[PDB]
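Dear U.,

Please find below the material for section 3 of the report. The protein was modelled together with KXN; I have listed the sequence and SMILES used, followed by the predicted complex structure.
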Amino acid sequence: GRVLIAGATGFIGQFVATASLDAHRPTYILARFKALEDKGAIIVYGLINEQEAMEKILKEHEIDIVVSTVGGESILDQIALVKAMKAVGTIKRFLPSEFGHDVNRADPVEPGLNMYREKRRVRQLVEESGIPFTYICCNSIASWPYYNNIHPSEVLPPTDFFQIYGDGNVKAYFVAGTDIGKFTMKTVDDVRTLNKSVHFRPSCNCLNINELASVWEKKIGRTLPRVTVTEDDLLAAAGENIIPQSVVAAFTHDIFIKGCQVNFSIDGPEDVEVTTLYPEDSFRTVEECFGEYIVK
Ligand SMILES: NC(=O)c1ccc[n+]([C@@H]2O[C@H](COP(=O)([O-])OP(=O)(O)OC[C@H]3O[C@@H](n4cnc5c(N)ncnc54)[C@H](OP(=O)(O)O)[C@@H]3O)[C@@H](O)[C@H]2O)c1
Ligand SMILES: Oc1cc(O)c2c(c1)O[C@H](c1ccc(O)c(O)c1)[C@@H](O)C2
């Protein structure tokens, strides 16, 4: 079961590539590294928007599983990759660059809406093309959710005051990067994830923004002022159409005002949830992730 990962030097990719190697899977990583190579990765060169070159790669390296983690500005570059997988005809599982919310249920404002249009466009190509697929809807990476930052976990949470979105009482789910990686790779050849959406709903990590603030306060041993950032504030940031800041603002609204991660049931047959798939296999808690920062 050989795995090809596009986007392995990206923020999500690094965790997915590291996890794959840790699980002892043959892992090829597409290059436009050192740590990944020292752990066993085989680097192969190409871009996912070049159909004929991807066909060559999938054929030559006998690739079984393809995982794409390209960024929000490269979503449509996956069109060529899909056409290439359809042509070689041998792919056992494709995971497109999802790694967030359920794009078919959520309804963020613009310019968030348009990234989801692109993601839905890929999904429909995947399915009409007959590629077997798994969609990873892993909710929010465990960070302080800054309203205009695409990689928020790369920044330390606040040490002056908290900007609390709305009432600060809408739940979201937070998952460590290492857990996104680990559980993503368990799904790629699981019979139960074939042609499914996989939702990450770790119940201990279901927290609102106020609760998150208190977890950080308890780490810093000190309280901060809390101020309100309103729905209008966020929609005005979204309305500015500055890419990718306004996109993240759209998503923050969807998450912490409209409650998109938690407002639907996963009880239907096309939806599965990670903790029920992989029981007695604990997620890292937000307390524990925030502990990581407290080593600055
Ligand atoms: N839920 C969350 O908290 C969360 C947060 C972050 C992102 N996400 C989602 O995760 C997914 C990954 O985003 P990201 O932020 O990790 O992206 P990123 O950090 O921008 O990394 C994207 C990776 O894809 C590569 N790539 C882009 N175009 C390529 C192409 N045409 N050919 C081959 N490789 C290419 C890039 O390599 P180069 O550097 O060489 O261009 C880079 O390594 C996105 O769909 C995003 O919506 C979710
Ligand atoms: O569905 C989602 C949910 C999220 O929380 C996020 C998503 C997508 O993607 C966002 C994003 C937007 C533009 C980008 O270029 C990118 O790499 C990531 C990310 O910052 C946070």
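For the text of the report, you could mention the following: Residues 138-176+200-264+279-296 form a domain with the UDP-galactose 4-epimerase; domain 1 fold (CATH 3.90.25.10).

Regards,
Y.
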